[PDB]
Amino acid sequence: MPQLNTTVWPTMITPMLLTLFLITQLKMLNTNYHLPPSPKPMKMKNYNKPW
Amino acid sequence: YYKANVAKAGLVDDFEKKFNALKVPVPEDKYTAQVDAEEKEDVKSCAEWVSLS
């Protein structure tokens, strides 16, 4: 198995650490789902007059 | 009809003289002014209401 040549492990670990904990997460953090527009046509409490 | 009928001495004339010489007490308002002033004050209040609105 080449998976066990434990002199090439750092060069496989560290760029994964980057691309999984930094770059992909930044790529997500720029993906935002705005809440749907809820145009409530009913927002009117002014009052009656003093009478 | 009341002089040629009554047999009393001038009672028609003095009774109806008291009538034609009677002041009946004219009632007085004493109430329109207060409600007029109330109306003016309310006009003020709702004038400013409509200004705000």
Side-chain angles (χ1 to χ4, degrees), chain B residues 1-17 19-29 31-53:
Chain B
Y1 186 60
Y2 297 150
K3 182 179 181 59
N5 192 357
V6 64
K8 283 85 170 192
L11 178 140
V12 54
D13 208 299
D14 66 359
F15 274 1
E16 192 82 8
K17 198 184 66 174
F19 168 78
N20 57 61
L22 173 69
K23 180 264 307 175
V24 67
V26 183
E28 59 88 19
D29 310 337
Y31 288 101
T32 55
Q34 65 180 21
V35 310
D36 295 359
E38 158 66 42
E39 184 192 275
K40 296 146 169 262
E41 179 258 0
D42 197 75
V43 159
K44 179 265 300 178
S45 158
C46 274
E48 55 86 5
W49 189 98
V50 77
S51 64
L52 154 75
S53 280

Side-chain angles (χ1 to χ4, degrees), chain A:
Chain A
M1 292 324 260
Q3 280 79 349
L4 280 75
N5 171 30
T6 71
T7 198
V8 77
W9 277 22
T11 186
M12 298 289 169
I13 308 291
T14 81
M16 189 276 304
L17 291 194
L18 284 203
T19 187
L20 174 64
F21 286 66
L22 195 145
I23 301 184
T24 313
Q25 299 198 356
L26 296 188
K27 284 284 197 186
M28 281 300 110
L29 265 187
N30 206 43
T31 285
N32 292 119
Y33 306 94
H34 66 77
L35 303 97
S38 178
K40 183 163 72 74
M42 221 60 58
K43 179 68 180 46
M44 203 289 302
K45 187 54 185 170
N46 162 11
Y47 192 47
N48 200 61
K49 269 67 57 179
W51 49 262

